Amino acid sequence: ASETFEFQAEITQLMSLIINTVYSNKEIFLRELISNASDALDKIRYKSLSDPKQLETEPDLFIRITPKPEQKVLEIRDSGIGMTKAELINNLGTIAKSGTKAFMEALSAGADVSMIGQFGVGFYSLFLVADRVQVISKSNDDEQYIWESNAGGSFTVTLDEVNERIGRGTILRLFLKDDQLEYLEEKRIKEVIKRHSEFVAYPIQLVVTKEVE
Ligand SMILES: COC(=O)c1c(O)cc(O)c(Cl)c1CCC(=O)Nc1cc(O)c(OC)cc1O
After folding, report:
1. H and E: helices and strands count for the chain
2. Residue 203 CB: number of other CB atoms within 10 A?
3. How much distance in Å is there from the Cα of 197 to the middle of ligand 1?
4. Which of the four CATH numbers 3.30.565.10, 3.65.10.10, 3.40.640.10, 3.30.460.80 does domain 1-213 have?
5. CA of 210 to the centre of ligand 1 (A)
């Protein structure tokens, strides 16, 4: 059984705006997700300073990107702090965010969509290239859960009994729009990373599937 929740009014507005925008530099979405991953990694790392055992659930700190072409899916994973069920509901939708309205007004004035991250709502830039997203997360303090949204007014949270076990961390599973399948390509992904995420303190791994020769 999955519980359904409504997004705070302004967040629904932002998503509708983003998923329908004409913007030409949509690649910045990956920069934002990598940045968020790094911040979650910083949090578990900082937390481990006074409680090292917090790391035992997943000793390695990394960001991993996995293209799943057959499903037109792009996964961005990190072994950061992760989110409990309550945090998913809180952080991803029900609580108002300081910059949602301000960012939208900035866009109306001509601001570059690339500024989204500075308004603290970069997560939603994922809708530039995807029309559906599943956030799979495992915090040391809770079971693994699935938060899902299609840019509509509500989202779902479900106990995870269908995905690979995450030691600790979060997986953003993006279901790419048909005209944005280029982000499934190793070449494209690498250039976006080098260009926007040169200064990341964690290893960024890319999972590539090749047919044997
Ligand atoms: C802890 O953040 C995450 O686990 C995480 C991640 O690993 C990858 C991501 O792409 C995203 Cl979006 C996240 C969630 C980031 C987030 O929204 N954190 C957050 C939000 C809040 O509103 C808040 O105040 C209650 C605190 C947060 O940490």
Report:
1. 5, 8
2. 10
3. 19
4. 3.30.565.10
5. 33
